[PDB]
Amino acid sequence: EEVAVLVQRVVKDITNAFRRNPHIDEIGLIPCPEARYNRSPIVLVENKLGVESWCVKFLLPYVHNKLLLYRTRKQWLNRDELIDVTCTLLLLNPDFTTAWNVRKELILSGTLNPIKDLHLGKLALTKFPKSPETWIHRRWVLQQLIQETTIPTERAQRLIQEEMEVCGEAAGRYPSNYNAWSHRIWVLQHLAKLDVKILLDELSSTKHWASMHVSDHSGFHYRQFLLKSLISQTVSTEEPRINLPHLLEEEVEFSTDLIDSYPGHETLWCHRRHIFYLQHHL
Amino acid sequence: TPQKDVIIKSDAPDTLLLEKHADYIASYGSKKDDYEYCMSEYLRMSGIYWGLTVMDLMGQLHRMNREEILAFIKSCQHECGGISASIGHDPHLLYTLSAVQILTLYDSINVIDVNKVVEYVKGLQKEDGSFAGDIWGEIDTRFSFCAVATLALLGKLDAINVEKAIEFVLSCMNFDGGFGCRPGSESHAGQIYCCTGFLAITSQLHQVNSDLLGWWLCERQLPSGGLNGRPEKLPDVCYSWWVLASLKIIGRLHWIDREKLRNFILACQDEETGGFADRPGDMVDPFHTLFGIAGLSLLGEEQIKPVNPVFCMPEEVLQRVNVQPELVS
Amino acid sequence: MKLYSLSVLYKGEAKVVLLKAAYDVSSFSFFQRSSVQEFMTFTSQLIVERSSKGTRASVKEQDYLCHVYVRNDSLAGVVIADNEYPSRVAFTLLEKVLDEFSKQVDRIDWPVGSPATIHYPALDGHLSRYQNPREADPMTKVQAELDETKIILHNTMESLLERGEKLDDLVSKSEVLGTQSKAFYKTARKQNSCC
Numbered sequence A: 001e002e003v004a005v006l007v008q009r010v011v012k013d014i015t016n017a018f019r020r021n022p023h024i025d026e027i028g029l030i031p032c033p034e035a036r037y038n039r040s041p042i043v044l045v046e047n048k049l050g051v052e053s054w055c056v057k058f059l060l061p062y063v064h065n066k067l068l069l070y071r072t073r074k075q076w077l078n079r080d081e082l083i084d085v086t087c088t089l090l091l092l093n094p095d096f097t098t099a100w101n102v103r104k105e106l107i108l109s110g111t112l113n114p115i116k117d118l119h120l121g122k123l124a125l126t127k128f129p130k131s132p133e134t135w136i137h138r139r140w141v142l143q144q145l146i147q148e149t150t151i152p153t154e155r156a157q158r159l160i161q162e163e164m165e166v167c168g169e170a171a172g173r174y175p176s177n178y179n180a181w182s183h184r185i186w187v188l189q190h191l192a193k194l195d196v197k198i199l200l201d202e203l204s205s206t207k208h209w210a211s212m213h214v215s216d217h218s219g220f221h222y223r224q225f226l227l228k229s230l231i232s233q234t235v236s237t238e239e240p241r242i243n244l245p246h247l248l249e250e251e252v253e254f255s256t257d258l259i260d261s262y263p264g265h266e267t268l269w270c271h272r273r274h275i276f277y278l279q280h281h282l
Numbered sequence B: 001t002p003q004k005d006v007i008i009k010s011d012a013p014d015t016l017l018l019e020k021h022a023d024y025i026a027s028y029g030s031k032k033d034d035y036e037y038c039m040s041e042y043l044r045m046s047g048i049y050w051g052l053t054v055m056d057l058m059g060q061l062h063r064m065n066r067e068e069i070l071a072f073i074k075s076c077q078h079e080c081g082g083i084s085a086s087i088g089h090d091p092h093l094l095y096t097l098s099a100v101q102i103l104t105l106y107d108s109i110n111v112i113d114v115n116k117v118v119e120y121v122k123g124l125q126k127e128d129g130s131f132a133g134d135i136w137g138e139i140d141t142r143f144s145f146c147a148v149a150t151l152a153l154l155g156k157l158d159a160i161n162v163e164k165a166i167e168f169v170l171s172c173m174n175f176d177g178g179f180g181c182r183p184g185s186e187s188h189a190g191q192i193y194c195c196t197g198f199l200a201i202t203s204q205l206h207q208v209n210s211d212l213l214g215w216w217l218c219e220r221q222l223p224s225g226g227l228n229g230r231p232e233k234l235p236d237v238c239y240s241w242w243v244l245a246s247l248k249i250i251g252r253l254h255w256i257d258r259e260k261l262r263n264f265i266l267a268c269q270d271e272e273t274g275g276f277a278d279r280p281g282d283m284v285d286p287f288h289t290l291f292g293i294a295g296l297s298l299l300g301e302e303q304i305k306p307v308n309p310v311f312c313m314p315e316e317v318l319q320r321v322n323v324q325p326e327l328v329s
Numbered sequence C: 001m002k003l004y005s006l007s008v009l010y011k012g013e014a015k016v017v018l019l020k021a022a023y024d025v026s027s028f029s030f031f032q033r034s035s036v037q038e039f040m041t042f043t044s045q046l047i048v049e050r051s052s053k054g055t056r057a058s059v060k061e062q063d064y065l066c067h068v069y070v071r072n073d074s075l076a077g078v079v080i081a082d083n084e085y086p087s088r089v090a091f092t093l094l095e096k097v098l099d100e101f102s103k104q105v106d107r108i109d110w111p112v113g114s115p116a117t118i119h120y121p122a123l124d125g126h127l128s129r130y131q132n133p134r135e136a137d138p139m140t141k142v143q144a145e146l147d148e149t150k151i152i153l154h155n156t157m158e159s160l161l162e163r164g165e166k167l168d169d170l171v172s173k174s175e176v177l178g179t180q181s182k183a184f185y186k187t188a189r190k191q192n193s194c195c
């Protein structure tokens, strides 16, 4: 029908939307029953990218089927075309593993720049902040940025801090976002190598976040992880030794100060309960 | 403020609608919706498995097109031996397990190159005994389970480094007794199912503190009767499988509150359409429909076939293949 | 710990009147903020339409918690928060506003009030301050005679409606909700995650 050209126009509208505006915060769905005359469903307001709902029922299966044809070698696509379709495909359904795998091959072949995928996933995590495959792909991309060939490099800390931001924002959009906090932990293990400095900075900054999300056991587990990792590293940067029993008593105080303020939340109960385990085993 | 939990209404279902559930799964996908198909095709193979198993548990597997599915599965096998979620998609250990599970239900594992499947799974194990989802190296305890679950149904458990595989899973056990996706992860009822299922297959349940872990699992039950996966999470019917199956494996199922949980599961039915939602009054789907039925079967629902807590399949099916792991007495 | 809505109404004999409201739809997705704000307006009015004079109640929904205070002089005040936010601090905020509301606005402007006619710019000031209860004023005079624990609780907002009263017929019929907001409720596309 006319859908063949109405949709193929959109995949360029989205691609051109990124060239026009590099600083796009989030993507979103705009409630729209039917198409507006000669108006693209791709609406760019401020730093926000909107997609009118009427086109989604047409846009997705077009791009979806196009990638599968490429994967099965039923239809050839330019590497520029391949990037464009996978991009619009993953903004609609980031759980589509194969599309991510295709981009992996592009990155590994040298066609695609790894940073472009980080920013892509970052946008996808605004509409789908809990999408498992997105976090999975992120780990592969990050792992490729270390295999390029002690405190990690300056560029590494730039990436790590970037991971702390997206894991935090994704934790704010969905309550008890397991996959988000699990990724944040994974970063500190492989990207930061349990750096004593970063562990402390993470412990300090997230203390306020925990007070504003008391029912988020995933966030409080991150607290437990930070503390548990500090014990492993300590067996200036030598002060956490005397501070180790002090941080644990500060944490149990901070938790008690929340249970007395906000009773009922079993997370706070479970958190303190877990902190007790740390103090008893030293 | 009250605890975060659902409130079961009086007009909510309290009777097992076994027939309407069979009709729901049977008429699923009948509507020509291209959008919904594409959206969920990335896990379609697992979707088939959920659909067929819940029908077999109700003894209505015959209502499903055996031949059409068996063709689909044979098309989803690749050169590397792995099975993808659907035709065209990339192979993955998840849908490799789902495919084998389906072929086992239909007693036709020969439709697929069994030897290649074993090779694919074996080539996913790392040096530390962990398992990856595919060739891209994503590590998860789910994959450790999917590996041995696939091989056990093929009678090829000794193909992989069993001793080293067990070594890794035990390194994912947290102090609370639970398991995560990776070492140092937050305990998750779903991840616990995989690990307890793993250790059941590899015969290492003696490495599990049944009292401690069973305690953690029983803490998932809320005043409504429903179960969740983690502390302060809304009750979910799918977790009435992940939690119960773990309990049955470690031998602590009797600790749970039978009737209250049963009334929760039944309350998540749809009197009009059929199938189970995650909570009473929500949209239903084949996923929650299976684990709702499977949960009731574990609780002792006599209208439903006894389900194996490890492989999530009818016991009679796993009796034929001589694969029934010894559980904790 | 979040505050979504904070409005002051007047329960008349014929209809319920919106006088002044404050919103904070920043936590929501951008292109849905317009619709969400309208629902919180539609909700707050519907609560008062089912609330008797001189009673306190807390209507609970999934991941959302509404707190209503309808005084004896039919001056209603509704605050909408999440499940984390304590009800005691919610009713405390409702009381300190309704008292300072009669101080600045006369009682004769209540039955014919309007968001453009009523002069009360102290709502956004309080809504943003009472976000974190550990930063709010410690009014012990209010909380002393506040809670008799007679706060009626509701599992859903269906408990307020009649026996055969469908909520869907209250959404698509409302003149408060926009045409895209009515669709937003029907085309809610019920949540999917954990599949």
Ligand SMILES: *C/C=C(\C)CC/C=C(\C)CC/C=C(\C)CCC=C(C)C
Residues within 6 Å of the ligand: B094, B142, B145, B146, B189, B190, B191, B193, B194, B238, B242, B310, B311, B312, C193, C194, C195
């Ligand atoms: C909300 C629940 C989710 C997202 C899934 C929780 C379950 C998990 C994490 C375990 C996954 C288990 C797998 C993939 C094994 C295959 C499943 C069965 C054999 C039932």
Ligand SMILES: *C/C=C(\C)CC/C=C(\C)CCC=C(C)C
Residues within 6 Å of the ligand: B025, B028, B029, B040, B043, B044, B045, B047, B048, B050, B051, B052, B285, B286, B287, B288, C194, C195
């Ligand atoms: C979690 C998402 C679900 C359950 C939707 C996808 C379901 C399928 C795919 C199952 C369809 C196949 C049959 C009913 C045989």
